[PDB]
Amino acid sequence: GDQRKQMLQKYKEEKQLQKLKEQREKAKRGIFKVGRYRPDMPCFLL
Amino acid sequence: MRECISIHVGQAGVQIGNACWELYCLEHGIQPDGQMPDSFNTFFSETGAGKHVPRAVFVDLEPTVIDEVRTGTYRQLFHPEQLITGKEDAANNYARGHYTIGKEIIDLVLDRIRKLADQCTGLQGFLVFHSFGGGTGSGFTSLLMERLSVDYGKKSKLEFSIYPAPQVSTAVVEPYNSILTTHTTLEHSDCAFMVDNEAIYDICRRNLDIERPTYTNLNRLISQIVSSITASLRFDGALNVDLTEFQTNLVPYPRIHFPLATYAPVISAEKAYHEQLSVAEITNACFEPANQMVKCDPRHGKYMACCLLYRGDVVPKDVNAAIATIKTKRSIQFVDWCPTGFKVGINYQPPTVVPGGDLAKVQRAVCMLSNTTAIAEAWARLDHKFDLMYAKRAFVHWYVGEGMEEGEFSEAREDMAALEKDYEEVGVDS
Amino acid sequence: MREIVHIQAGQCGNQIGAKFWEVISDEHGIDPTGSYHGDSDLQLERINVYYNEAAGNKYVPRAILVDLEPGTMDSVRSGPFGQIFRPDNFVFGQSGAGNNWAKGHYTEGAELVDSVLDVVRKESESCDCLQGFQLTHSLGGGTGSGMGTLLISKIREEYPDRIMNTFSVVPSPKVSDTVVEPYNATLSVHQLVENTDETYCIDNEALYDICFRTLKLTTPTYGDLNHLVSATMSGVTTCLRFPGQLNADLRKLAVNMVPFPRLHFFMPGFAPLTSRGSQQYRALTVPELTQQMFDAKNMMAACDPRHGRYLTVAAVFRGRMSMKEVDEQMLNVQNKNSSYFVEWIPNNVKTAVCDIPPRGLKMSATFIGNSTAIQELFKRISEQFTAMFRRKAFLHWYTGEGMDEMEFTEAESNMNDLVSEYQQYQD
Amino acid sequence: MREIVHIQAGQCGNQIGAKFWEVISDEHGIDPTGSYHGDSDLQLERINVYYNEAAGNKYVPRAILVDLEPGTMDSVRSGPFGQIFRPDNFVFGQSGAGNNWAKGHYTEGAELVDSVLDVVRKESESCDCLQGFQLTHSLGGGTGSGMGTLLISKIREEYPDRIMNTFSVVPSPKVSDTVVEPYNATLSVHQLVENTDETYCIDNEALYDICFRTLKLTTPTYGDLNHLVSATMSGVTTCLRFPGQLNADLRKLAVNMVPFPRLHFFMPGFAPLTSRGSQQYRALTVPELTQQMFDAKNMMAACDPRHGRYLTVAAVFRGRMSMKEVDEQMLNVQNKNSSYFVEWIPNNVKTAVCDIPPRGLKMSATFIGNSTAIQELFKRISEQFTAMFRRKAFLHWYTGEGMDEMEFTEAESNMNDLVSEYQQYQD
Ligand SMILES: Nc1nc2c(ncn2[C@@H]2O[C@H](COP(=O)(O)CP(=O)(O)OP(=O)(O)O)[C@@H](O)[C@H]2O)c(=O)[nH]1
Ligand SMILES: Nc1nc2c(ncn2[C@@H]2O[C@H](COP(=O)(O)CP(=O)(O)OP(=O)(O)O)[C@@H](O)[C@H]2O)c(=O)[nH]1
Ligand SMILES: Nc1nc2c(ncn2[C@@H]2O[C@H](COP(=O)(O)OP(=O)(O)OP(=O)(O)O)[C@@H](O)[C@H]2O)c(=O)[nH]1
Numbered sequence A: 001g002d003q004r005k006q007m008l009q010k011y012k013e014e015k016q017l018q019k020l021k022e023q024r025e026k027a028k029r030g031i032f033k034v035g036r037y038r039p040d041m042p043c044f045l046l
Numbered sequence B: 001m002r003e004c005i006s007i008h009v010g011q012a013g014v015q016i017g018n019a020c021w022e023l024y025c026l027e028h029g030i031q032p033d034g035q036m037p038d039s040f041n042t043f044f045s046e047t048g049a050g051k052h053v054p055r056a057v058f059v060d061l062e063p064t065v066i067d068e069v070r071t072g073t074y075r076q077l078f079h080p081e082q083l084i085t086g087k088e089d090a091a092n093n094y095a096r097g098h099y100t101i102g103k104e105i106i107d108l109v110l111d112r113i114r115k116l117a118d119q120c121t122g123l124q125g126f127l128v129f130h131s132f133g134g135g136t137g138s139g140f141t142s143l144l145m146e147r148l149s150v151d152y153g154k155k156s157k158l159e160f161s162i163y164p165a166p167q168v169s170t171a172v173v174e175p176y177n178s179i180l181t182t183h184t185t186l187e188h189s190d191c192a193f194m195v196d197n198e199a200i201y202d203i204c205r206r207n208l209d210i211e212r213p214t215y216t217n218l219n220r221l222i223s224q225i226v227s228s229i230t231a232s233l234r235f236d237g238a239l240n241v242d243l244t245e246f247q248t249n250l251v252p253y254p255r256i257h258f259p260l261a262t263y264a265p266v267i268s269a270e271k272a273y274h275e276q277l278s279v280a281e282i283t284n285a286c287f288e289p290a291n292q293m294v295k296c297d298p299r300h301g302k303y304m305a306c307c308l309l310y311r312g313d314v315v316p317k318d319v320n321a322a323i324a325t326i327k328t329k330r331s332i333q334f335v336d337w338c339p340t341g342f343k344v345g346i347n348y349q350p351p352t353v354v355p356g357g358d359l360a361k362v363q364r365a366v367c368m369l370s371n372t373t374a375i376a377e378a379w380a381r382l383d384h385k386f387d388l389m390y391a392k393r394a395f396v397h398w399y400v401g402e403g404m405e406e407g408e409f410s411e412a413r414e415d416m417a418a419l420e421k422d423y424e425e426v427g428v429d430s
Numbered sequence C, D: 001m002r003e004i005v006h007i008q009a010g011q012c013g014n015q016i017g018a019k020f021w022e023v024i025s026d027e028h029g030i031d032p033t034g035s036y037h038g039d040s041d042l043q044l045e046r047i048n049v050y051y052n053e054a055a056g057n058k059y060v061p062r063a064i065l066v067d068l069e070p071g072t073m074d075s076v077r078s079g080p081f082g083q084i085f086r087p088d089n090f091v092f093g094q095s096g097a098g099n100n101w102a103k104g105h106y107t108e109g110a111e112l113v114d115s116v117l118d119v120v121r122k123e124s125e126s127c128d129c130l131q132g133f134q135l136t137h138s139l140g141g142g143t144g145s146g147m148g149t150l151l152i153s154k155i156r157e158e159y160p161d162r163i164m165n166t167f168s169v170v171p172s173p174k175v176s177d178t179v180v181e182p183y184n185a186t187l188s189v190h191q192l193v194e195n196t197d198e199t200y201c202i203d204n205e206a207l208y209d210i211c212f213r214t215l216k217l218t219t220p221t222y223g224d225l226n227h228l229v230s231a232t233m234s235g236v237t238t239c240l241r242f243p244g245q246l247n248a249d250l251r252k253l254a255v256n257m258v259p260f261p262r263l264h265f266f267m268p269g270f271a272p273l274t275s276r277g278s279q280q281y282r283a284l285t286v287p288e289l290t291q292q293m294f295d296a297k298n299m300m301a302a303c304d305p306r307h308g309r310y311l312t313v314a315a316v317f318r319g320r321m322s323m324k325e326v327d328e329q330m331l332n333v334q335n336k337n338s339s340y341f342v343e344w345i346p347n348n349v350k351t352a353v354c355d356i357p358p359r360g361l362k363m364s365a366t367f368i369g370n371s372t373a374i375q376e377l378f379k380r381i382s383e384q385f386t387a388m389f390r391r392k393a394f395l396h397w398y399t400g401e402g403m404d405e406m407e408f409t410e411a412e413s414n415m416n417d418l419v420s421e422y423q424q425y426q427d
């Protein structure tokens, strides 16, 4: 049964690796988006 | 001159402030729209002609209760910039109220406080209203109080807090926030008044025979307490108590600034006729362990200093008689190093009654604020709950994920432990 | 301002969401044409949490209706209040999952889900300060379970700091609609463990049992079940949508009910629930609401709380109510039943009170309970899955669609780990 | 006063021009007979930009109707608002270009360009202060593509300081109607590159995609496509025809969108474009105009903007709107999509706002964008031309009446050079 859990860990690692690779590929260019402003907070004397 | 600024943080603080300002408007004759058809200069600033704006500020990370104020019957009393509103609630999280959500709203409320403080010329101090349980009322209150400490400095800081009850509490993650906020309140506060909701409930059930009281009665009682606190400054009396004198007489050591407030006589209309409410008997009822608004036992505690604030038809001689009778009672004991431990304040004007309120009109009223060691037991079981929940690291991630570490959890724990040790070693005989 | 985006996946999810939108438009006074005909300003002072202001002084839901069969879409549109939804939010394919989690998560749902992501993206960008998303879906089918799970994963990837809600109906061993329910449930629960902030475990057994013994309803159809789920969904967010003595948004319940990140499976409940014949013989008071909430029969998951320990309990009250007696009732509940509450958490019950009650009642309460009795709901699913997994039963559909047996093995391992952690926090 | 002379070449150009005159006369309140019947006085102070004063309070367009097949002008005259045109502005031959750029440019275009130039000379000398010309044509045929290119060249030596504006329907790989589209398109681009100040690349594929997914139009005929093109044409000159908060004539858009003289191929668009059933559910504000007009599906070219970088964009807003909202929306578009805009040009957006909206709508926006996605739209034509040119396919036609292989070679070289420079400035 130890071989089965070793294969479990290996499969989870491979899935995490491919998911991280896809995330890195996606993060290079964000998708086009449009929304409201969220204006910057004013600065005060302090 | 002789002004003080009220700060209301959290839902509890905002509702208590609503009750307080309704009571103040009733006291000074100011209508809810601000027009009065002198002594009101303490809490209200006169703008232009026939317009009084309270020297207050309302802060929340959620828009429910603030917008309730903005649409309520007192919407004309406050200007919109006085009521500051966030977008997302702290959600019972000290981390959220202190680091993530409190950082982008602290600057604006401090600017409002600055613009409200330079307007007055005799600022006595600040009145911060909050609760220990809430994430906003803990985290943002701690942040605002440390900013006020670093900004104003020697100005007095008086805060009113809703300490959690031993058994009556409505938040699961409450002890974490309660420990964390006190960890900074120990050094950024000058006098922290303590109130338990369960004790208000017990007083309402017994004295005012209300079978189903809700938060409005609690806020009315707290508003009466704060009005009795500020009456010596908003009016004239035989013996006047100022905030600085209050702190000097009530706080013996810098870390010991957590007195317990009691108010008397708090009775219904039908029970008032049969009672000849004398000064001596209300003074005795102040020391009754059933009338404390903190769920604790003064009998197993030891008194260190108490301030007696009288308002109404009260002359000093019967006050001296009542105090002398109190001294002769063995059930109420005081520390040896405080041979005289009574600060006396008499005010001529009687406490007013809010229309629709449960309290009855009384000729005399007493608000005693005693700094005693009975709150060591309160700190003790709050700390036991904190330890018992922190052993399993429950809810810790809900704070760690918001710019916060376990190391300061432990440091707040040991700071509280040092606090109980301080109370224990000041309560011993010499 | 703390607005919520609603998504419905599958036939059950779509029907539950349609009923929820009907009851929440009744609560906010929105007619089936979308215009406002309410009486109180409190119905509009928080109208942006669920509705988008359209031109013409009328409102459209912030809902995206998702399925893989156009038939459910047509049924939802054709029914009452079905015109209020924006037509472009209706996202559907043509083939359908066919009770295949693989077809709903890897090939056909994956092909369709780009449009769903685009629509939820434009909805989240149009609104002011989004706080989270809520999804209604099943776990027995392939459309709901698989494609809603994919949608949850995508949303969590795009919005990692927002709160996920899933009013998900779980399969049950006695009323088992389909043959492949445990496969679909296990595969969905895999990603619902980590990709959802909190999940509401509902199932048809407890709903039917309520309609039998509590409501005394002779022949309840799916409409009454969906109405119950809708009432609970509305009572969860009534603190967001209306003022109250003590407010509690979804994040506050999340931080007060999830001590550890993987324990966010709750049994919902609603009170009061009385039959028509017993309506006049019952007293209008808060202690009987508390008793109706805390008894085993009112639970909407087929888990008896007496077999487990409560970790955290939520009680979102509605109506003009007193706080002292509510707190006293909760204290008595925690005192008389100290054995049924976890010992290392003092004050196991969080209380929230709203002032606006549901229509037709002057007082109501919503029960949300996090208890270790949930573990047996996963025990039964896991043992059914293990029974079909030793013999490779029905696996050829998923394998031919593109999956592999090791995905099933690791999903089972994940559920077994969750069950073990619930057991070892039960003590 | 800042008059515009309109020329229409080919059947497509004449159809789009007839629809454009339809919508313009609707804007200015000109009846089918050409006489004023509008209500607002704002419809008359700028009537001379497109119309001439006839005897008896009658308005005739400044339009030249050019084609080789007389049937097109027969149809234009016989249709609605078709008698408004001047009878002798109609110029026609008898043969027809026969889908041949060569015969539309050399053998039967030349004998007609003399008359066309005489007519446009009369119109230009009649007008007070000319600012430029408008030509509507398609690149697929021989009349439109070939003879319009010739006409543009002739106008350029005759009026080099006036602005050259053309609205050119380019061929698409999906919507392909004639076999020799690559030849005509390449030969026409070879002259639109250096003979035009701004070119609005229209295409039928994107227009059909609009009429499918955006307008939800069941059976889009050419009338609807020409209506969209006419709406864009009216949008680009609204500031000339009406007052506004910010005014931007053709030259201002040209100077704000042509960083280098050869990159004057713009990707047009319009907003709002709503379905009949869906317009009832849509909020109508500046942000929703902004999100529609920047959406890749809304664009009037068969090239995804996400595949390239915006050199410059123009937002010719119409209607009573706040300038803070407009400028802030443009700011947000530029910030959250910094990867889609050229870094060496800060403030990539040119914004103009008029106050007179199109009839039936209270606000509208015309998107114009100078993007680097034109490179692939031209590479499609280039590769089709190369495929048809290695094998000498159909070259015997063009060579039959004066053209030679070197002209095709230089046209392909010019298109390749323009694609390469778009790629270079894309980086
Ligand atoms: N409480 C409710 N349960 C429902 C309802 N409709 C269906 N169901 C139950 O949900 C389960 C199946 O869910 P669905 O039929 O919605 C499956 P889905 O369409 O999501 O997937 P596919 O069938 O593979 O497309 C099964 O137990 C049904 O009896 C409903 O309106 N309410
Ligand atoms: N958007 C539109 N495209 C049109 C319209 N009419 C034609 N076309 C398209 O134009 C393309 C070819 O242009 P035309 O048919 O007008 C050719 P033209 O008359 O300019 O030259 P010859 O016919 O060779 O003399 C072809 O794809 C047609 O479908 C129209 O009204 N709108
Ligand atoms: N006495 C009294 N206590 C109140 C009242 N309202 C709330 N509280 C107390 O406040 C505690 C929670 O804090 P809240 O004020 O409700 O919320 P908050 O301060 O805004 O912080 P958040 O939880 O993040 O919203 C509860 O445990 C209550 O005991 C009130 O009207 N009167």
Ligand SMILES: [Mg+2]
Binding pocket: B010, B011, B062, B089, B134, B136, C247
């Ligand atoms: Mg709060």
Ligand SMILES: [Mg+2]
Binding pocket: C010, C011, C141, C142, C143, C144
């Ligand atoms: Mg289905």
Ligand SMILES: [Mg+2]
Binding pocket: D010, D011, D069, D096, D097, D141, D142, D143, D144
């Ligand atoms: Mg032709």
